[PDB]
Tab-separated table of C-alpha atoms in Angstrom:
chain	number	residue	atom	x	y	z
A	1	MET	CA	-5.949	-24.397	-14.639
A	2	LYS	CA	-3.613	-25.054	-16.996
A	3	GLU	CA	-3.663	-25.620	-20.923
A	4	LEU	CA	-1.329	-26.432	-23.826
A	5	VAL	CA	-0.845	-24.190	-26.874
A	6	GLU	CA	1.001	-25.549	-30.056
A	7	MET	CA	2.221	-22.990	-32.976
A	8	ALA	CA	4.296	-23.324	-35.698
A	9	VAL	CA	7.876	-21.653	-36.052
A	10	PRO	CA	9.446	-21.701	-39.548
A	11	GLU	CA	12.981	-23.639	-39.367
A	12	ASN	CA	14.826	-20.578	-40.966
A	13	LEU	CA	13.404	-18.282	-37.873
A	14	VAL	CA	13.890	-20.768	-35.065
A	15	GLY	CA	17.486	-19.369	-34.183
A	16	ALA	CA	15.224	-16.273	-33.579
A	17	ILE	CA	13.349	-17.722	-30.915
A	18	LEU	CA	16.119	-19.702	-29.014
A	19	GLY	CA	18.176	-16.464	-29.575
A	20	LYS	CA	21.351	-18.225	-29.138
A	21	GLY	CA	22.385	-20.593	-26.105
A	22	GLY	CA	18.536	-20.305	-25.428
A	23	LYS	CA	18.973	-16.938	-23.971
A	24	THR	CA	15.616	-15.784	-25.048
A	25	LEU	CA	13.566	-18.778	-24.635
A	26	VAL	CA	14.758	-18.723	-21.272
A	27	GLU	CA	13.742	-15.164	-20.536
A	28	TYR	CA	10.143	-15.817	-22.077
A	29	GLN	CA	9.900	-18.501	-19.808
A	30	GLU	CA	10.996	-16.532	-16.826
A	31	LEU	CA	8.601	-13.158	-17.679
A	32	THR	CA	5.455	-15.513	-18.444
A	33	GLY	CA	5.842	-18.616	-16.016
A	34	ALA	CA	5.022	-20.828	-19.128
A	35	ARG	CA	7.114	-23.845	-19.978
A	36	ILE	CA	8.174	-23.730	-23.641
A	37	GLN	CA	9.398	-26.241	-25.568
A	38	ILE	CA	10.646	-26.426	-29.230
A	39	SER	CA	10.336	-29.829	-31.436
A	40	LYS	CA	12.825	-32.381	-32.238
A	41	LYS	CA	16.128	-30.186	-33.518
A	42	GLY	CA	15.205	-32.445	-36.614
A	43	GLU	CA	11.228	-33.085	-36.924
A	44	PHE	CA	8.634	-30.640	-37.960
A	45	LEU	CA	5.067	-30.408	-38.617
A	46	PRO	CA	3.033	-31.823	-41.722
A	47	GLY	CA	4.080	-30.983	-45.149
A	48	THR	CA	6.446	-28.434	-43.087
A	49	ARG	CA	9.484	-27.265	-42.617
A	50	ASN	CA	7.877	-25.711	-39.107
A	51	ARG	CA	9.376	-26.920	-35.872
A	52	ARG	CA	6.778	-27.324	-33.327
A	53	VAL	CA	6.630	-24.908	-30.635
A	54	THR	CA	4.499	-26.190	-27.456
A	55	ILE	CA	3.527	-23.903	-24.628
A	56	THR	CA	2.004	-24.854	-21.404
A	57	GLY	CA	0.767	-23.046	-18.299
A	58	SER	CA	-2.210	-20.898	-17.494
A	59	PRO	CA	-4.229	-19.277	-20.292
A	60	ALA	CA	-2.880	-15.924	-19.630
A	61	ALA	CA	0.525	-17.309	-19.535
A	62	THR	CA	0.676	-19.334	-22.296
A	63	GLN	CA	-1.033	-16.490	-24.038
A	64	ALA	CA	1.732	-13.752	-23.288
A	65	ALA	CA	4.714	-16.608	-24.213
A	66	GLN	CA	2.624	-17.076	-27.702
A	67	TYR	CA	2.249	-13.506	-28.425
A	68	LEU	CA	6.009	-12.866	-27.182
A	69	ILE	CA	7.221	-15.399	-29.427
A	70	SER	CA	4.906	-14.214	-32.447
A	71	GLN	CA	6.502	-10.846	-32.450
A	72	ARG	CA	9.584	-12.495	-33.476
A	73	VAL	CA	8.265	-14.730	-36.076
A	74	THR	CA	9.573	-11.995	-38.676
């Protein structure tokens, strides 16, 4: 069983998630086995300046990746 988690990441912190070169985003995927994607390098959520991050995989994989990203959201 697989699921999709969608979370918000303020535009001024996204450089944190990527880590530059995508290094971190690749590592988090690597460690968890969850696929992680960040919204259009131009568009955000609602009356938002938060980009949308989509995480897919097993519930446990998805939760470990959301958690690890959350630690870096300042």
